[PDB]
């Protein structure tokens, strides 16, 4: 990402040091008044949020370099009260407080076209998984999430493509016995303690808005595996 | 890069 | 809104006309290469996608005063086959093209913000959709569904809280059948004069939380007014 | 599904 890079020089010349994390650390959690605006310039993470009952549900994930905001950039007030937890065994992020935020794209247009590009990825996103969701049932969702992961890890091979990911980052009833279907079906198979794509045109098929949005919104890690 |  | 008015004369003042819509005209369609930055002002509209076997998958709905986009304002690319049908009778929006709208924006940042804080309340909005649905299924996917609707049509009657939105439109599945069923059964709605009423806001509230509580931050006073 |  290029323009990842340059927002990343822009944050780090206005003051704003790189930050470590560790797996299972949030970068921002669900009380915190403090409304943030994290620049994850790597690093794999998840949006959760706990329920009253104290069930947490993963919400969204994340992947460098992306901007996640938990606060309005203007009033400050929060967005939603969510948590940001790392996946990734280690990621890094910048942390900028919404004000400060504020000035440093109000002194700046690109980085701010920037950031709000990243919002309208969010939004286009959105309405594809749910477009594929309304179509083809739960299947499509699923569909789309192994085909964003085919995607951003794939990796050709005589076999068929790959994901190099660790088991545990792969692993996070019915969804899997639907998983189960698939596996016999043999759209993908696991090999050599690893997952291998198959075919990749049954994930197309039944995920087609999400794979619009990847060639639309990700033209070129997209295309080296078309 | 993006979302997932 | 305030701030949407203040935007629409600052449109108006760089020479923006106002252009009118009938029901059922397409303000853009998926094939037009040109990527535009809609604000809608007044009516209703929804952005719809269409498969290869030709079915019109219906995706959202928007009521102005909003914001649309075609294109990613960093890059102009599209941001998807997408089309956006209006669906009130005669609707008044603001159509401007891709770097029109940039330059703008790039000269007055107030409204920037205002845009860009429009987006964030769509994330947030998908997000604490899918935590209700995720926490209590269909049901309170349905309870959010006409939660906002409520929200933002509710009118303290004394039978309640009547849905001050046209009938036709309302209108605009076994399950969800059910699920109403028992709505109109356990009196938390009722289907009196034909208009959709509403008397137990607190079991809204209840399964569809995450959805109130984006309603209260994105919209505090029209959240206020109900409670 | 939704008006936002």
Known sequence: ?226 | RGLL
């Open chain 1, 1 to 226: 990402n290029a323009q990842a890079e340059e927002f990343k020089k822009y944050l780090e010349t206005n003051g704003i040091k790189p930050k470590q994390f560790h797996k299972k650390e949030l970068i921002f959690n669900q009380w915190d008044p403090q409304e943030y605006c994290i620049f994850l310039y790597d690093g794999i993470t998840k949006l959760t949020s706990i329920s009253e009952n104290g069930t947490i549900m993963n919400l969204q994930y994340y992947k460098g370099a992306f901007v996640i905001m938990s606060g309005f950039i203007d009033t400050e007030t929060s967005v939603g009260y969510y948590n940001l937890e790392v996946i990734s065994e280690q990621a890094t992020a910048y942390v900028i407080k919404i004000n400060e935020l504020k000035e440093l794209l109000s002194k700046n247009l690109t980085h701010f076209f920037y950031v709000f590009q990243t919002l309208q990825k969010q939004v286009s996103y959105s309405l594809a998984k749910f477009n594929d969701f309304s179509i083809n049932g739960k299947l499509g969702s699923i569909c789309g999430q192994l085909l964003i992961l085919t995607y951003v890890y794939g990796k050709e091979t005589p076999d068929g493509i790959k994901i190099t990911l660790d088991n545990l980052t792969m692993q996070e009833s019915a969804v899997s016995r639907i998983i189960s279907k698939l596996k016999q079906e043999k759209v993908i198979v696991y090999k050599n303690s690893c997952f291998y794509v198959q075919n990749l045109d049954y994930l197309k098929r039944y995920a087609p808005k999400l794979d619009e949005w990847f060639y639309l919104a990700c033209p070129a890690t997209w295309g080296k595996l078309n």
